[PDB]
Amino acid sequence: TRTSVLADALNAINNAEKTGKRQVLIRPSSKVIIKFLQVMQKHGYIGEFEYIDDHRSGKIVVQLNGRLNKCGVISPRFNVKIADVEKWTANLLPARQFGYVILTTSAGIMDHEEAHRKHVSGKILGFVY
Amino acid sequence: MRAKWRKKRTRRLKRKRRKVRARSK
Amino acid sequence: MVLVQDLLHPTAASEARKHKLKTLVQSPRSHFLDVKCPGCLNITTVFSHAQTAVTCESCSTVLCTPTGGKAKLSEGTSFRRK
Amino acid sequence: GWVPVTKLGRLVKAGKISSIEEIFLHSLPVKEFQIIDQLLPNLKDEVMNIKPVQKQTRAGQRTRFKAVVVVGDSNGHVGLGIKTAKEVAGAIRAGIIIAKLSVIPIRRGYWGTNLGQPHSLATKTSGKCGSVSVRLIPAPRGSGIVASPAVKKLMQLAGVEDVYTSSTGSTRTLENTLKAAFVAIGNTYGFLTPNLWEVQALTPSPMDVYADYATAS
Amino acid sequence: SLPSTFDLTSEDAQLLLAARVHLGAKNVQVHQEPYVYKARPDGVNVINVGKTWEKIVLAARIIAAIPNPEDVVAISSRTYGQRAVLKYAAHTGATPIAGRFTPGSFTNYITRSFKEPRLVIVTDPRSDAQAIKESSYVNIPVIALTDLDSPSEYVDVAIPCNNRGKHSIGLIWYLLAREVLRLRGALPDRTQPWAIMPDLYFYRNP
Amino acid sequence: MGKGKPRGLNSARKLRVHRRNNRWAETTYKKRLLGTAFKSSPFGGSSHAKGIVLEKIGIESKQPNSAIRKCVRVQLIKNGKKVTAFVPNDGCLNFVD
Amino acid sequence: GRVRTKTVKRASKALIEKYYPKLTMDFQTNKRLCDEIATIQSKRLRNKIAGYTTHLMKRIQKGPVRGISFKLQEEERERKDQYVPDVSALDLSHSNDVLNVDTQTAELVNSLGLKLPLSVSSVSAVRDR
Amino acid sequence: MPKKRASNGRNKKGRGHVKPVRCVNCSRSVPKDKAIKRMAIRNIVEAAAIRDLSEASVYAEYALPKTYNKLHYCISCAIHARIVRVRSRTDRRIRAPPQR
Amino acid sequence: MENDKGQLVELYVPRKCSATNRIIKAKDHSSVQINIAQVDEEGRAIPGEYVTYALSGYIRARGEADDSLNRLAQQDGLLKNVWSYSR
RNA sequence: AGGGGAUCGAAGAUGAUCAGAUACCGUCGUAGUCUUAACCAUAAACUAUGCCGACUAGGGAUCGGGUGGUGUUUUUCUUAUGACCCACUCGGCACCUUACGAGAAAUCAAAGUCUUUGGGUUCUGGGGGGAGUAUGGUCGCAAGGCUGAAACUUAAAGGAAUUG
Ligand SMILES: [Mg+2]
Ligand SMILES: [Mg+2]
Ligand SMILES: [Mg+2]
Ligand SMILES: [Mg+2]
Ligand SMILES: [Mg+2]
Ligand SMILES: [Mg+2]
Ligand SMILES: [Mg+2]
Ligand SMILES: [Mg+2]
Ligand SMILES: [Mg+2]
Ligand SMILES: [Mg+2]
Ligand SMILES: [Zn+2]
Ligand SMILES: [Zn+2]
């Protein structure tokens, strides 16, 4: 089966961005996807993206910016206990300096810097660097 | 020696071993 | 199809070419052909892929032999589009 | 004893390329050797290992010597030459010469917070040569280079003050571990950041600008 | 941006169309590669002309952009272009290579025929290929006269063209030289068929 | 690829049972879990063993080198097992007696 | 087994390169011309050089040759490349009618151009290969 | 030992385990795929007749037929003489029918 | 990148490919600078003025350097009718 | 356990050869082979490539489905089927080039999207041997299978490629 759509989508992104396609298509297209992408937009790893409504399921067209390096997804959505964020981001992203860890939470879908300001953690989805 | 025969070798060795332990019920 | 395609607006050639499923929107490419039999002056809305030996409204004229894809319209018959 | 072939050779003799960045800026194919000595005076020049390496013959064998040479400074440029010549000295010579062609700069970063001059890597990089991954993996200040002796000496000549490594795979084959730690170094300017997001103008190269001064009459 | 002047003269189209530049490439058709305006039935592809000549100007614009002209190494191996390249050599003084390239001519700073281009021109990336694949080792563009069958690996500014050969090769070189001269040179006007001649290029009776 | 092993947020058991039952091919772990040290290994899983020199042997060594090694068959006290101990240094089985 | 050596063929190649003039077909002349210019130690070698030079001259009469195209041989094209036997007419004019163009080409001409000369062919696609 | 070939036995691809053919010379059972299936279209009469036969014969033009031995060879059997001919690593990629 | 208060550390601030935005490295022997001369009215190619376009080695070796340079030119006004939005 | 047994044909006889050779070859030729009713349950049962899932590159072909061509020919006048050509398409089976991607490499468009490490799942392996043995189950008419040890032993066993 097609399991984690988010992953299965971000995989296409990661393939697209690897070759230098200026865009990608993403079949299934969720809230999470869009709130994940929305996050990439707010930092700037991603251009426009255009959610098609198949009178049906979803479908997205992303515009890549040549800025994504990796559009990570961590797989069993591990629960994170606020301090353990530091151990995830340390182990996933290059450097204390720059990068983001896209985590769903009580607050919605933040990145790990926004989630530290708020003082609210939860599950992880993926990351970007 | 050739491994198929080294297999066949230890097949007889078992079938002799079966007669030995069967001689004491 | 390399690097930059602007994938929201394909050329209609591609849409017509690609699978009826494998486009931006799954739109079927079948129609409800309004067939007229030689007998009665009345028009049956024959779906082009019937799957059935399609009779008329009452008289047993037999309109369309259901083949695999589109049905072969039985004998010298006439039809409107959709 | 100079006399250059290659536009760029003549061009550096004229003194219109300053040193060195411009070469890298326009990825200029530095096939000649003299160039890098002229521009970079502080190239030292350290032989890692020298295996004997023998071809087998109708009778006996052919002992060549693959001398591995990390060339560098503490500025932020490093070289890696391997050369197999039958005489050993000549091999180190030709190794040093090759290492000064392959010479390559290193994005040196922080650690975390800028404060003082950078002397770790920016990011976690990796190399992969044969079956060695060198990963490294920027330190915090003063923690030291933490490395296989081979990787360390490469990272002394870089001027990376502090970095953790995860030299992984058969790191005992040194040619490869260096080639790995060379590529992981190469990767740096090559990995993007949000500090590059800001777009540049794309300058004209010295070749395009100083056309007349390059080439023969 | 543009002058809105160069829209291809009605005669020059007739010149291109005379050489069958757009009645070529055939069945075989690479997927890069949008220089088709329609395809004629059975063993034919029809090349979009406007796309060619905008690039023939673009190429020239780049060829002009190198200040030192004795530098743009044109190359040809496959015989039908050999003479045309040497004509392009004569008008715009830019050392080229007819026939055999010699590998290690852009690389390998010892060879007798060591060039060092700051632009390369090629007729058949099927054949001259080597020189193209070589040029990648030393950071040079590669203007090429690609048909819609040939590979454009390590190629920038691929002029669409018919490479059955014979006429179309020499014609398209001549239209380059033309627009390289018009873009900085003697000729100040797009008009006047002038002389020169297209037939100066072309393949000869051996 | 999924990479063999399970990845569920509720897998755990199919990890923790798998790693119990692969470990068993780790020869470090097997000796520790099965008490080869205690049940075998002449010394009782112990640094040392006092044992009475039953005889001074000369053991002709394996190949490349060639030397009779001057050893001692022992009888380990505690277990009553018999082993063969080497005697290091020039002669010194002379000192062993 | 008279195949002339490298030095023979190397010199004689470099001899005719620098001195196409001062080489009259016949041997004894070219022999004395060789001992003048190039500084041969031997007698036989010098005679053997002269022997190849001649064979190069005698080929030169029957057209040019590969590896032997220096200055005068370049010019002995070259005129012909410059002033070609062709062309009368243009050539590549609309000599017979006004171009037998195809339907697809006529349609292409109409899109880009406005009014050009045409002679619409039938476009017989044809059976078999 | 890695793969010499990608095909190996060749026809067999998408096809469990096909039937075999006894070879000609050795009578060595080989799959009808691994088989080296040469065609020997030989004349019924050898070239150095043929005149002699047609001289003594009744009729003109004649049947003069050709026997159609579709041979097979057990690769080994084939190598020992026949079309096989041990090619170079790079040359082994070529499927082109030889000569012609 | 920026130490203390600006003071831009780290030289070699790189050519980023015009097509991909991907970085062109110091040893991208494959990278390029296409320079294109500016046009003026009635002939004239304006000596010493270029619209520069770097290409990455990636797009160049694939073959996607062709159409990316078109689209690059097309957007930046050196062409018409060449690169299409849809295909 | 039945039926049949043509030829080959484990066993055997037997004719040569070689220092010898119950080994090829030679000649014959029960068991089988073939089949039917039971079992057995393993094979280089090998694509030595688990299954599903997505996405990355072109080339041309290749076939089983399906579209369009005032295309060509069939010719019984328009034909209409058929059969191609050409372009593109869902499904299948495999090649070419560069690899910028993988890979120890051979190679691989999957064995890619992996130290820039996380789509889902099942299984297997942890130096070589000892050993697929000992034992104990368990299954089998049995052969044997499945399951599966250590003590002891040893510095290599491999793999791929390079030159000889
Ligand atoms: Mg011995
Ligand atoms: Mg082997
Ligand atoms: Mg073998
Ligand atoms: Mg094996
Ligand atoms: Mg199948
Ligand atoms: Mg099978
Ligand atoms: Mg016998
Ligand atoms: Mg098995
Ligand atoms: Mg198996
Ligand atoms: Mg073991
Ligand atoms: Zn009715
Ligand atoms: Zn045989």
Author numbering:
A (entry chain W), G (entry chain R): 2 to 130
B (entry chain nn): 1 to 25
C (entry chain b): 1 to 82
D (entry chain C): 39 to 255
E (entry chain A): 2 to 207
F (entry chain X): 1 to 97
H (entry chain a): 1 to 100
I (entry chain V): 1 to 87
Relevant lines from the article:
Type IV IRESs form a homogenous class of viral RNAs, which completely dispense with the requirement for any IFs and thus are able to directly recruit and assemble a translating 80S ribosome by themselves. As a result, two stem loops (SL-IV and SL-V) are exposed and are responsible for the bulk of interactions with the small ribosomal subunit. PKI is an independent domain of the type IV IRESs that mimics a tRNA anticodon stem-loop interacting with a codon.
To gain insight into this process, we assembled a pre-translocation complex with CrPV-IRES and 80S, which was subsequently incubated with eEF2 complexed with the non-hydrolysable GTP analog 5'-guanylyl-methylene-bis-phosphonate (GDPCP). Several rounds of classification in Relion were needed to identify a class of particles consisting of the entire complex that produced a map with an overall resolution of 3.6 Å. Thus, the binding of eEF2 in the GTP form induces an extra rotation of the small subunit as in canonical tRNA translocation. However, the L1 stalk is 'pushed' in the opposite direction relative to canonical translocation, adopting a displaced position that is wider than the widest displacement seen in the rotated form of the CrPV-IRES/80S complex. The ASL-like element of PKI is pushed into a position in-between the A and P sites of the small subunit, reminiscent of an ap/P state. Additionally, a superposition of the CrPV-IRES in the ternary CrPV-IRES/eEF2-GDPCP/80S complex with the conformation adopted in the canonical, CrPV-IRES/80S binary complex (excluding PKI in the superposition) reveals a displacement of the ASL-like element of PKI of approximately 10 Å. Domains III and V of eEF2 solidly anchor the factor to the ribosome through interactions with ribosomal proteins uS12 and uL11 in the 40S and 60S subunits, respectively. These interactions help position eEF2 such that two loops at the tip of domain IV contact PKI. In our structure, H694 interacts with PKI while the diphthamide moiety (DPH) on H699 is closely packed against the sugar of nucleotide 6189 in the CrPV-IRES.
